[PDB]
Design a protein around this ligand. Sequence first.
Ligand code: NA
Ligand code: NA
Ligand code: NA
Ligand code: NA
Ligand code: NA
Lengths: 93, 146, 514, 146
Amino acid sequence: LSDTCFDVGVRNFDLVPDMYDSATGHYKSDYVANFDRDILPIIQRISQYQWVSNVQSMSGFFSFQFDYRDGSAANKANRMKYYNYFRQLDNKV
Amino acid sequence: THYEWGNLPAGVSVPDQSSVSATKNVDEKVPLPPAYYSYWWPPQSPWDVLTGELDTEGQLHSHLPAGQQINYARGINSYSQMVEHWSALAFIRDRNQNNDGFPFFTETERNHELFDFKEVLVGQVTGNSEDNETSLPVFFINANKE
Amino acid sequence: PSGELLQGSKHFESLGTLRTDSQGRLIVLGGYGFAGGNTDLGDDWYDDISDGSVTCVVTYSDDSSETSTAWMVVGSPDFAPEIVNISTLSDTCFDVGVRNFDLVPDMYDSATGHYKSDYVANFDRDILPIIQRISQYQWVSNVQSMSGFFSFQFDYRDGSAANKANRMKYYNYFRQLDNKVIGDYDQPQQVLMSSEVEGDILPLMPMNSGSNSVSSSNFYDLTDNVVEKFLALDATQLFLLGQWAEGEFTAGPADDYPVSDMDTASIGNCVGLPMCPGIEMTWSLQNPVIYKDAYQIKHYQDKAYFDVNGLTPERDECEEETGCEPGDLTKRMACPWQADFFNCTIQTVNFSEPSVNKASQTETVTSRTHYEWGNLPAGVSVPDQSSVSATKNVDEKVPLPPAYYSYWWPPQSPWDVLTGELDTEGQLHSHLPAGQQINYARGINSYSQMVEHWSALAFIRDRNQNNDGFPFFTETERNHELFDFKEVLVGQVTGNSEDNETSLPVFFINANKE
Amino acid sequence: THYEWGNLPAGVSVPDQSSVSATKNVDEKVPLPPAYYSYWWPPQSPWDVLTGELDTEGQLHSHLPAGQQINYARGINSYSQMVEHWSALAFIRDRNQNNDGFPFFTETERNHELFDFKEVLVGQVTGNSEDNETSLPVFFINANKE
Ligand code: NA
Ligand code: NA
Ligand code: NA
Ligand code: NA
Ligand code: NA
């Protein structure tokens, strides 16, 4: 629910002006994320759904078969494969 | 159903018998196949958990040895049983809390004394005594227990 | 086994087929799944399994010969060929080779009987495979306690002194190997947990049953029957994990051992540990007395000796150090093999008494039924009634509580698998939607049902094979049409109609179905 | 319940384990024992009757041989079921009416097709494969039937 209140805050309350442009209604593609603060928690959360459910298909997203920290252009294809397995959000129509 | 008699003596002929039966089941709200077994909120409402009783006493009241994956809500067989017995449910916590990066989450503080146990042999269901080599566990709450 | 068999398979015709390709390469194809006997279910019983000598004579243009040899082993189906056993049979043959055949002289000193602490291990070649194997036991078992050993919560590649404590914590969770002494039980392989202190609890690694979680010290009219409760890696695997813990390792390429890629390709797909007996082979493969060199079986006698006299039945290739006779590598396994496959599931291991696996249990149930009548009219008194009942159940071989739910060989015999039927047709014949974890052997309710229906079992394989690091293993090719289904409501068991809100699935094989 | 482990090796021993549980059933309007099994209006409401199907097509749909004492309302298991399917019950008729003083009353005109059957092996109730040599007759009405 903190992710909810935070998401609401970004797209509607200028919480982070470097991440979102309220005039364009769009996010800012020049925003530099940080692994440990923005990315690692998600990888950590997925990894703990196992003790309470059988969600083995989620395994390959916290196995570090490739370096998740490595942001070099050589590693882009791996990070793109990982990312394009995530579902995009639906339009509210 | 088709009936036919054989091993009858020379000269003896018995006419076969035939009968047609029918059953029709209608359901209004049913998931449409192909279906996928999907979870709701595993952190807030567990469903696939480990056995955490480590001593003898607890293994006799729980009827399961430690470290086996079994249904979180086993024993509560109805919505009204959950309205009344929700607090007899286990807390899922790390038994290795003091060692980072080495978690071991099990069931802890489950009210084992409320649930009765019944080991149902497969034959009791199939009528075949061979199937009695295998059994399945049935947990339930007896309202007449005190 | 001549004639006709009263039970199971009726006629024995062959042990398999020998072929050559377009280039004259040998192809050894084994048994068809024959299993029959003359006793109910087992004395007069037999199977299709085999093993033996491979002899090659390449004659040249100048009419001069060159004779070379090898071994052949036939096994029961590998139902998840992609999932690897933490310790394979190649790991066994390799470990034997290090400690007994100088395979790697930089790693072991045969004069001191000890390993060499100055050996520099390599992450990718010695360490990463173990981390990769542990990570795949999930698709076939529920071994979540093993998770923290492939989570990369810390950098496994980092060998800097700052990272030593983390690598030492990881390493000291692994079980050390037991001494091969006859009556010494209080050892590390009889130890399940890391501690008994709440907040410091975790099953020691590898979390699997050992080579004897079944019989106790006092079984078979003995007082010192050998016990080995829980699993450990082999000597060579744990040693290299020791070198990594220490930081005596590298990142980047490393040269392969003096072993062929072809030699590991075979036995690498066989169970190394545990051996009770195991799936393809047993603890004869651990004895160096069987080998002439690392990975190379010693051959006892010649073709002429066998043409004249046949095989030696009473002979132990472990006692007499002179080599193997055809059929020696498989003779210790069950007859028929379906027994070993039937018991390759899970063990319920005692973890309080080092020398006990099973004991006799005695349950006494003493009840008092009490009857009392009320709402009776003024003046009317009815005497209460009381009766005492008793029940006494005695069992001879029962695991001693506290018990731990332990696995046998998850890669070779699956037990906790996912539903893989993706279309409607298949979801109606299977009666389960996709992606649900359910028992691998559901439907087969007896040892004799497994003797007859073992080939109706599913193959566990990656549905995402084309995308590395993104596996998705499910059931595939399960003979769904054989199994009937029955949704049993809880009330049918408890007599309480409320419990009928919940049900449980019952799968079985009807012999009258055709 | 009391547990006791044995066949343990020399010097080895484990503590006994024992538990005490209880059940309490309170039933409001129950007849007082000792009681006598007493009929109401046998000629207007038959209870213990004889099956009178003389051919194969009759015995297959009835599942019973002729001349057997069984319950008149076998298959009617509910008060609601009686309100729905009363007219399915037999008429007990003298089958030797022509002859005088030689009567032979049996069931006639039963709607056998409405009723489904199931032979329950005793061992399916007890868990004991050995009781399967004996089976219990169970008649019921299935609404899914067409
Ligand atoms: Na859930
Ligand atoms: Na939570
Ligand atoms: Na297994
Ligand atoms: Na395998
Ligand atoms: Na009456």
